């Protein structure tokens, strides 16, 4: 507002959105010009302080006033960080006489921060389609039986002494007395996925599909791989995969699509020939003979009964990656005919992988989260991106996955449990994703989101897998107590936040379910139509996100965090649009004066709540909109 020995925090802003960063994914030779925003005439000077990993030192770049925003309310200060190959971390020092403030990935600060700085990873690139798409996850057996001839039947076969049980579509997922939950089948398959492709890409609008394991394995989840080179017979054959991939990539049935596979590379099933615990193959596996040609693919403490595994499960023997150039690293990703490259190269050309239990991948039976583990995911990236630079790499991780993403040498993104799923669950349903009592206020929710968003490079943020539920946690509908309205707010949010909106099959209509395996129920297709309130909004929302780049790659600015009325409003914006999102997490209606001036929405200009179609006019920097309890508006211009 003026030069008064006071830096006004409310006027301050910056992130790597279009208005502030002219190069968010630069090469070794591209300069990064940054723009800081402040209330007009509020400061005396500003500077950029960045740490360059090339010489391990802090560098200084004084900023200069660049311009005013259309409403003459803000000042934009600029500075440029020189182009080089090295990773850089920056923050801002803001001065107004005797007052000094700092700003970085975590927003304003009275004292100088030492963490949460903004990133500059030269030559690091996350595929843009992932950044701008909407994903739909499918647990094969439970989506749609499109071919009843490949169905696993009761007794069809046995695993570790247990016969398989077949369920009627819609029945409980729990095994009946005498059977195992891992050996319960409903019939979902690849042909089913292909036949319902119209529901995916059109009825909903999603353009990205992510499949849980689909390779030869005895269980129903299939994380106990028996053969990476073959599609499990129950889901079809490799030929079926090809037709599906072609039908997904096809733009003759809707938006061009991308397929992402589940890569279970940390371990193998105990029935995989390399191990062959039950001797299902003539060859000799590691378990049967210390002279086995694959003996060293695993780690034994006391051969053959005690060996390394995934969290103690004997059915999932841990793979030993050894050192660079090892046979294992070759069969998984180095060899041209490896698991990762085989499916990434024709005649399959899938578009990416979901790294299951990626934090554990290691050598000699160790648990990862160490140097070797990271060295491995670095070679993995060179192998993948070497075959196709636009093939996505998303690792599974429940906490801060900064160690595997913050240097642009490993994954493109990660399963956003901590930055999306948990905060959303606790804010809307008052439970954590495992359905335990855990509630947070709007203020707390907005902070939680900013802190976790700051853990990652901007392009990683835009590529994070944001789901309300997934195959390992309780369903949102159950955590909601059945209140379909909470699902409405959740959807509206999910489709307007930073990151790849990811729909866990069934969530779009309000499916319920507890802990594994009850969170993997068969899909109720009578509810899969626009006649369902939730399904309709999902589609409405998806259409809206695809309409505005500002929602996929724009900036994010908090506008309202009211704990009294439980209202949360934020804005997504770029060079073309300004979107004010208003959310009501209360159980009663509220009239909100949305301060759209913060997004520089001109007075007299009109805005439209793309959810209702109702138009509004910006007067005195505000927009008054009434919103029902557990719902929201999407004011766009």
Ligand X SMILES: OC[C@H]1O[C@H](O[C@H]2[C@H](O)[C@@H](O)[C@@H](O)O[C@@H]2CO)[C@H](O)[C@@H](O)[C@@H]1O
Ligand Y SMILES: C[C@H]1O[C@H](O[C@H]2[C@H](O)[C@@H](O)[C@@H](O)O[C@@H]2CO)[C@H](O)[C@@H](O)[C@@H]1N[C@@H]1C=C(CO)[C@@H](O)[C@H](O)[C@H]1O
Ligand Z SMILES: OC[C@H]1O[C@H](O[C@H]2[C@H](O)[C@@H](O)[C@@H](O[C@H]3[C@H](O)[C@@H](O)[C@@H](O[C@H]4[C@H](O)[C@@H](O)[C@@H](O)O[C@@H]4CO)O[C@@H]3CO)O[C@@H]2CO)[C@H](O)[C@@H](O)[C@@H]1O
Ligand U SMILES: C[C@H]1O[C@H](O[C@H]2[C@H](O)[C@@H](O)[C@@H](O)O[C@@H]2CO)[C@H](O)[C@@H](O)[C@@H]1N[C@H]1C=C(CO)[C@@H](O)[C@H](O)[C@H]1O
Ligand V SMILES: C[C@H]1O[C@H](O[C@H]2[C@H](O)[C@@H](O)[C@@H](O)O[C@@H]2CO)[C@H](O)[C@@H](O)[C@@H]1N[C@H]1C=C(CO)[C@@H](O[C@H]2O[C@H](CO)[C@@H](O[C@@H]3O[C@H](CO)[C@@H](O)[C@H](O)[C@H]3O)[C@H](O)[C@H]2O)[C@H](O)[C@H]1O
* Region of 155 on the Ramachandran plot (φ > 0 left; ψ -120 to 50 alpha; else beta): left
Rounded CA-CA distance 524/541 in Å is 22
Looking at the Cβ atoms of 40 and 630, the one nearer to ligand U is 40
Looking at the Cβ atoms of 160 and 400, the one nearer to ligand Z is 400
Q: Which of 52, 117, 270, 276 binds Ca ion (CB under 5 A)?
A: 276
Q: Which of 145, 429, 487, 522 binds Ca ion (CB under 5 A)?
A: 145
The partner in contact with residue 189, picked from ligand Z, ligand X, Ca ion, none with C-beta cut-offs of 5 to 8 angstroms by kind, is Ca ion
Looking at the Cβ atoms of 107 and 146, the one nearer to Ca ion is 146
Shortest reach from residue 484's CB to ligand X, in Å: 10
The partner in contact with residue 418, picked from ligand Z, ligand V, ligand Y, none with C-beta cut-offs of 5 to 8 angstroms by kind, is ligand Y
The partner in contact with residue 357, picked from ligand U, ligand V, ligand X, none with C-beta cut-offs of 5 to 8 angstroms by kind, is ligand V
Sign of CA dihedral 341, 351, 128, 360: negative
Q: Which of 46, 535, 630, 635 binds ligand X (CB under 6 A)?
A: 630
Rounded CA-CA distance 390/382 in Å is 12
Nearest to 544 by CA among 618, 613, 600: 613
How crowded is the C-beta side of 247, counted as CA atoms within 13 Å?
A: 19
Shortest reach from residue 145's CB to Ca ion, in Å: 4
The partner in contact with residue 628, picked from ligand Y, ligand Z, ligand X, none with C-beta cut-offs of 5 to 8 angstroms by kind, is ligand X
User: Would you count residue 485 as binding ligand X (CB under 6 A)?
Assistant: yes
The partner in contact with residue 448, picked from ligand Y, Ca ion, ligand X, none with C-beta cut-offs of 5 to 8 angstroms by kind, is ligand Y
User: Would you count residue 100 as binding Ca ion (CB under 5 A)?
Assistant: no
Question: Helix, strand, coil proportions of the chain in percent (round to 5)?
Answer: 25, 25, 50
Q: Which of 15, 21, 25, 42 binds Ca ion (CB under 5 A)?
A: 42
What's 518's DSSP letter?
T
Contact between 617 and 637 (Cβ < 8 Å): no
Looking at the Cβ atoms of 51 and 179, the one nearer to ligand Z is 51
The partner in contact with residue 128, picked from ligand V, ligand U, ligand Y, none with C-beta cut-offs of 5 to 8 angstroms by kind, is none
User: Would you count residue 323 as binding ligand X (CB under 6 A)?
Assistant: no
User: Would you count residue 448 as binding ligand Y (CB under 6 A)?
Assistant: yes
| Selected range binding Ca ion among 187-195, 397-405, 533-541, 607-615, rule: CB under 5 A | 187-195
Which residues have a Cβ under 8 Å from the Cβ of 391 and sit 6 or more positions away? 127, 344, 350, 351, 352, 353, 384, 385
Looking at the Cβ atoms of 241 and 440, the one nearer to ligand Y is 440
User: Would you count residue 3 as binding ligand U (CB under 6 A)?
Assistant: yes
Contact between 397 and 410 (Cβ < 8 Å): no
Looking at the Cβ atoms of 224 and 609, the one nearer to ligand X is 609
User: Would you count residue 533 as binding ligand X (CB under 6 A)?
Assistant: no
Cα-based angle 58, 61, 64 (whole degrees, multiple of 5): 160
User: Would you count residue 576 as binding ligand V (CB under 6 A)?
Assistant: no
User: Would you count residue 41 as binding ligand U (CB under 6 A)?
Assistant: yes
Contact between 403 and 374 (Cβ < 8 Å): yes
| Selected range binding ligand X among 30-38, 43-51, 228-236, 628-636, rule: CB under 6 A | 628-636
Shortest reach from residue 406's CB to ligand Y, in Å: 11
Shortest reach from residue 600's CB to ligand U, in Å: 14
Residues in the chain: 637
Report 48-107 residues binding ligand U (CB under 6 A): 65, 68, 75
* Region of 312 on the Ramachandran plot (φ > 0 left; ψ -120 to 50 alpha; else beta): left
Rounded CA-CA distance 496/493 in Å is 5
DSSP for 460-512, please give it: HHTT-EEES--TTS--HHHHTTT-HHHHHHHHHHHTTSSSEEEEETTTTTT--
| Selected range binding Ca ion among 41-49, 351-359, 360-368, 514-522, rule: CB under 5 A | 41-49
Q: Where are the beta strands (DSSP E) in 97-157?
A: 99-104, 107-109, 118-120, 135-138
**Two tokens, residue 459:** 């392009």
Rounded CA-CA distance 420/448 in Å is 9
- Residues classed as catalytic: 356, 396
Sequence-distant contacts of 303-307: CB under 8 A, at least 24 apart: 307/365
Site for ligand X, rule CB under 6 A: 485, 587-589, 628-630
> Would you tell me which residues interact with ligand U (CB under 6 A)?
3, 40-41, 44-45, 65, 68, 75
Give the interface with Ca ion as residue ranges (CB under 5 A). Answer: 4, 6, 42, 96, 145, 147, 150-151, 187, 189, 276, 279, 281
Q: Which residues bind ligand Y (CB under 6 A)?
A: 399-400, 418, 447-448, 451-452, 455
């Amino acid at each position: 507002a003026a030069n008064d020995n006071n830096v006004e925090w409310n006027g301050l802003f910056h992130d790597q959105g279009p208005l502030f960063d002219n190069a968010p994914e630069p090469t070794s030779t591209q300069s990064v010009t940054l723009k800081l925003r402040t209330f007009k005439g509020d400061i005396t000077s500003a500077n950029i302080k960045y740490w360059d990993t090339a010489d391990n030192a802090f560098h200084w770049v004084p900023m200069v006033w660049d311009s005013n925003d259309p409403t003459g309310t803000f000042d934009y200060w600029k500075g440029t960080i020189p182009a080089s190959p090295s990773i850089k971390y920056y923050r801002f020092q803001i001065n107004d006489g005797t007052s000094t403030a700092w700003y970085n990935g975590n927003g304003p600060s009275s004292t100088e921060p030492n963490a949460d700085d903004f990133y500059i990873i030269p030559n690091f690139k996350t595929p843009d389609w992932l950044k701008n798409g909407v994903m739909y996850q499918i647990f094969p057996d439970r989506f749609y039986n499109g071919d009843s001839s490949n169905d696993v039947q009761t007794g069809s076969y046995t695993y570790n002494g247990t016969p398989t049980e077949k369920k009627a579509w819609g029945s409980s997922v729990y095994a009946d007395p005498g059977y195992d939950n891992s050996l319960v089948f409903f019939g979902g398959d690849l042909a089913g996925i292909d036949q319902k492709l119209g529901y995916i890409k059109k009825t909903l609008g999603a353009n990205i599909l992510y499949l849980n394991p689909i390779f030869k394995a005895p269980t129903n989840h299939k994380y106990d791989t028996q053969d990476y080179m073959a599609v499990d017979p129950a889901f079809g054959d490799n030929s079926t995969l090809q037709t599906l991939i072609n039908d997904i990539h096809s733009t003759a049935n809707g938006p061009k699509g991308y397929l992402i596979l589940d890569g279970v590379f940390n371990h193998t099933g105990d029935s995989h020939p390399w191990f062959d615990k039950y001797n299902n193959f003539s060859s000799q596996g590691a378990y049967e003979s210390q002279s086995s040609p694959w003996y060293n693919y695993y780690t034994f403490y006391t051969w053959p009964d005690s060996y390394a595994s995934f969290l103690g499960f004997n059915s999932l023997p841990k793979l030993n990656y050894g050192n660079s150039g090892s046979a294992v690293r070759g069969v998984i990703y180095n060899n041209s005919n490896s698991v990762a490259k085989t499916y990434l190269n024709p005649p399959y050309s899938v578009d990416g992988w979901r790294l299951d239990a990626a934090q554990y991948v290691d050598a000699n039976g160790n648990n990862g989260s160490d140097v070797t583990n990271h060295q491995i995911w670095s070679e993995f990236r060179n192998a993948v991106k070497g075959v196709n630079s636009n093939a996505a790499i998303i690792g599974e991780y429940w906490g801060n996955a900064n160690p595997w993403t913050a240097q642009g040498n490993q994954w493109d993104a990660a399963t956003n449990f901590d930055g999306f799923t948990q905060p959303v669950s606790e804010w809307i349903t008052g439970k954590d994703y495992q359905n335990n009592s855990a509630s947070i206020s709007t203020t707390q929710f907005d902070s939680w989101l900013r802190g976790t968003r700051a853990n990652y490079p901007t392009n990683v943020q835009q590529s994070m897998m944001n789901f309300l539920s997934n195959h390992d946690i309780t369903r949102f509908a159950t955590r909601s107590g059945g209140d379909l309205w909470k699902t409405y707010l959740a959807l509206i949010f999910q489709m307007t936040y930073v990151g790849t909106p990811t729909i866990y099959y069934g969530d779009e209509y309000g499916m319920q379910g507890g802990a594994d395996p009850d969170n993997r129920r068969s899909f109720d297709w009578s509810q899969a139509t626009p006649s369902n309130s939730a399904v309709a909004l999902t589609q409405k929302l998806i259409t809206i996100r695809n309409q505005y780049p500002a929602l996929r790659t724009g900036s994010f600015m908090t506008l309202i965090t009211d704990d009294t009325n439980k209202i949360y409003s934020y804005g997504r914006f770029d060079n073309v649009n300004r979107i004010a999102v208003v959310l009501n997490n209360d159980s009663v209606s509220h009239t909100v004066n949305v301060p759209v001036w913060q997004l520089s929405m001109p007075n007299g200009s009109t805005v439209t709540d793309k959810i209702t179609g109702h138009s509004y006019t910006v007067q005195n920097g505000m927009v008054t909109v009434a919103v029902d309890g557990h719902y929201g508006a999407v004011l766009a211009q």
